Write a protein that binds this ligand. Structure first.
Ligand SMILES: [Zn+2]
Ligand SMILES: [Zn+2]
Ligand SMILES: [Zn+2]
Lengths: 65, 114, 49, 266, 44
């Protein structure tokens, strides 16, 4: 669907870090590890929360209805 | 579906009192108090503070079922020492320690940067 | 009383919100309807994982 | 002062790394529990949807709005809707903020938390404002609209406790560690060969003295030094997170004391 | 009442004794419009 607003485990906000993350992958050409590290996701639960997520809404917006 | 309301964990129900003091029939000069709408957060602290009182023979809390937010606290003090006074002294001690801790944290915070 | 009831009831055990209602004729020219109801389910004690 | 002591090792807008000295284990644990759950915070509790032609479901979006971190600075001069003598909600208990989004450009139109507009009267109280720790200043990515998709709704935010729902959680993860050298022996380390080489050494080990093999086990020692790191989400500043944590614990103890005071009635 | 077609952005108001099809389209897939009476959501 869309990037989860907050991490399930701890509760840290991660929804505001999605686009940025993507930028860190395509703009600065970083690996996922460093990209996640720069966003302040030290605990691997949030790190998971962003790395593991699949943005499905971008495929959902392809329909006209 | 059959899940209870969330506020039932901290909001007292209809007729439910906060503390239920009951004379213990087992050992003499003992008491069992039922704390409603409270969990380990309060029980563990109070029980641990009751053990500091050297005029308290016994002090133990327990949560009979995790479904219900409540816990029983058994206190046994020496003769000539009402257990309610032990509970009150424990509570006031807790409050004083927390106040001092708060003040110290506040003074230590003002000396920081960034 | 010149009519018999043929109304469709919501599931006795279920509940939710009417997500979308579809009205369309059939191949034989029969007006038929599909009503989709949406219900968000939250993991409860007893859910299989 | 005279009782427990604090030593702020690190401090920031989001985190506070400190050391609690002269404290019982139960008090530190209880403080942690209070900081995690029992702290008043403002968050979206009610959502009224007018038009929603976006991909996401109604209660989906609603759930996403519920987790939005709102300003809870002057939350203590706000009131619970259950306590307020009004109907449903008012300006003394709740903060109402609207949301009107519509697909304009051919490209994807993003709907953030900044798009939330406060409608109710705040009357001088620093409250309701959605926290934006974002660098671009957008905030939480709420939804995505196509070209003709429209999202029109209203949000009534009410004072709540994280014990009722984690959306009212003022803090994220709280780091907690006592006795890094296991001198109390509260933990029997699992191993295959060498117990010390396999298990990583904690940072807090730099703040205590290592055990001597010539010395026996100290059986009369308890737990005094506690290493904590409190992290806030944004709704309430860290210092105020631990401070209002302390105040909440103290207050709910005072409620029990008051109950004892009241049970003396015939 | 009123309806809205599936594969186009129209807004039909054809009640009973009308139904199919659509205005300036040709397809018979008609959906029903959202209610005016709003519903609340406990954002949890
Ligand atoms: Zn996390
Ligand atoms: Zn009110
Ligand atoms: Zn059409």
């Amino acid at each position: 669907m869309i990037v989860p607003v907050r991490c399930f485990s701890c509760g840290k906000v991660v929804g505001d870090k999605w686009e940025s993350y993507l930028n860190l992958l395509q703009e600065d050409e970083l690996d996922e590890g460093t990209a996640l590290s720069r966003l302040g996701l030290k605990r691997y639960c949030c790190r998971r929360m962003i790395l593991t997520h699949v943005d499905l809404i971008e495929k959902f917006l392809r329909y006209n209805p | 579906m059959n899940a209870p309301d969330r506020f039932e964990l901290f909001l007292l129900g209809e007729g439910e009192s906060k503390l239920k003091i009951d004379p213990d029939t087992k050992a003499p000069n003992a008491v069992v108090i039922t704390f409603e709408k409270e969990d380990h957060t309060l029980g563990n602290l109070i029980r641990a503070e009751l053990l500091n009182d050297r005029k308290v023979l016994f002090a133990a809390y327990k949560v009979e079922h995790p479904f219900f937010a409540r816990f029983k606290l058994r206190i046994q003090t020496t003769e000539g020492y009402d257990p309610k006074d032990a509970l009150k002294n424990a509570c006031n001690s807790i409050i004083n320690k927390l106040g001092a801790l708060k003040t110290n944290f506040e003074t230590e915070w003002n000396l920081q940067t960034l | 009383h010149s009519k018999r009831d043929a109304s469709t009831p919501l599931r006795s055990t279920e509940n939710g919100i009417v997500d979308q209602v579809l009205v369309t004729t059939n191949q034989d020219g029969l007006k038929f309807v599909k009503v989709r109801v949406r219900t968000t389910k939250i993991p409860q004690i007893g859910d299989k994982f | 002062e005279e009782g427990p002591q604090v030593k702020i090792r690190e401090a920031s807008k989001d985190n506070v790394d400190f050391i609690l000295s002269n404290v019982d284990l139960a008090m530190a644990n209880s403080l942690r529990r209070v900081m995690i759950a029992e702290i008043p915070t403002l968050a979206i509790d009610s959502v009224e949807v007018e038009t929603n032609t976006t991909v996401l479901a109604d209660e989906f979006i609603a759930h996403r709005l519920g987790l939005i971190p709102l300003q809870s600075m002057d939350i203590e001069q706000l009131e619970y809707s259950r306590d307020c003598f009004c109907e449903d909600h008012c300006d003394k208990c709740s903060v109402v903020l609207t949301l009107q989004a519509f697909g304009e450009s051919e490209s994807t139109t993003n709907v953030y938390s900044k798009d939330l507009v406060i409608v109710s009267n705040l009357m001088g109280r620093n409250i309701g404002h959605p926290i934006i720790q974002d660098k671009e200043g957008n905030g939480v990515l709420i939804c995505k609209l196509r070209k003709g998709q429209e999202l029109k709704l209203t949000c009534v935010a009410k004072k709540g406790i994280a014990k009722e729902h984690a959306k009212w959680g003022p803090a994220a993860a709280i780091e907690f560690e006592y006795d890094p050298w296991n001198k109390l022996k509260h933990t029997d380390y699992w191993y295959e060969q060498d117990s010390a080489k396999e298990w990583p050494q904690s940072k807090n080990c730099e703040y205590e003295d290592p055990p001597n093999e010539g010395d026996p086990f100290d059986y009369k020692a308890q737990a005094d030094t506690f290493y904590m790191n409190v992290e806030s989400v944004g709704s309430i500043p860290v210092d105020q997170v631990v401070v209002r944590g302390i105040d909440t614990l103290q207050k709910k103890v005072a409620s029990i004391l008051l109950a004892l005071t009241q049970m003396d009635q015939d | 009442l009123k309806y809205i077609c599936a594969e186009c952005s129209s807004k039909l108001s054809l009640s009973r004794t009308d139904a199919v099809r659509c205005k300036d389209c040709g397809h018979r897939i008609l959906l029903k419009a959202r209610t005016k009476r709003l519903v609340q959501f406990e954002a949890r």
